[PDB]
Amino acid sequence: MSHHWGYGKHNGPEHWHKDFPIAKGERQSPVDIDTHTAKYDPSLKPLSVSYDQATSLRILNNGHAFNVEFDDSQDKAVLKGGPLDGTYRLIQFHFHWGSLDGQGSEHTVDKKKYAAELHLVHWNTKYGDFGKAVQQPDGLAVLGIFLKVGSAKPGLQKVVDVLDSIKTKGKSADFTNFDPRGLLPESLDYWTYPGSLTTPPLLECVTWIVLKEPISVSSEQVLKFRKLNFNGEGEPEELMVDNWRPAQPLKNRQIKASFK
Ligand SMILES: NS(=O)(=O)c1ccc(C(=O)Cn2cnc3ccccc32)cc1
Ligand SMILES: [Zn+2]
Questions:
Q1: Residue span of the structural domain in which 29 resides
Q2: Which atom of ligand 1 is nearest to the CA of 196?
Q3: N or C: which end of the chain has fewer CB within 10 A?
Q4: Which ligand has its closest atom nearest to the C-alpha of 201?
Q5: Test site for ligand 1: of 7, 121, 206, most ligand atoms within 8 A of the Cβ
Q6: Secondary structure class of 148 (helix, strand, coil)
Q7: 96 annotated as a binding-site residue
Q8: Which helix (H) or strand (E) holds 212?
Q9: Which of these, 149, 145, 150, lies nearest to 189 by C-alpha position?
Q10: What does changing residue 7 to F do?
Q11: How many structural domains comprise the chain?
């Protein structure tokens, strides 16, 4: 039923459970990361992020966010190591962000909300494609990276500058040769836990890997995110803001830390 849901009073996160009852499941995302109770796990490995051959193809306003899509038909941009068994291939990235700098992230850190959160979505190659992977408990690995407002992120500007061409729902643009290495912080220290997609269909198929170090973006860069629209061309303007799901109950889960 993946239309009719969105980020408002009458169709936002508190209503999703009527169409998608797994919304109240046992391993929903995002969560608050309580840094004091996350366990350092010396068995966790460094994360291996291998994006040197990533081939972006296109950027799309899907009406909830915008997606930068990658050709995932070959063995190219891969996440492995960390808490993962096997290899996961990059399919898309997107962001969640606020109406104001004080909110926007989906995960929180000791209840702190960041201005935005980047999700690099990868599927486990043992399942052959994304659509089969999402039906499995180890099907996806999502690398989450917080954004704070400060210095500009130069590697983000090619994204920001294309947004006026995909202002409205359903618009796409060639978006080739974008290098997602330019969106990564210096450290790959992370927290990890088992969870879910944060939008409908809310499937419980994700190993979450959330980096501790945020990236900085400028006020001007996030302001351009907030000029996007959730409506389609020729409809009344609803700014694309506050496209985040709040933290969900941790229930029977442990968050592990790769560090300290
Ligand atoms: N925010 S997040 O990183 O957790 C996230 C990642 C991916 C998606 C989709 O692919 C949603 N979606 C879009 N089409 C789909 C077909 C099958 C299953 C899911 C599908 C939704 C949320
Ligand atoms: Zn997301």
A1: 1-260
A2: 4
A3: C
A4: 1
A5: 121
A6: strand
A7: yes
A8: none
A9: 145
A10: Enhanced activity
A11: 1
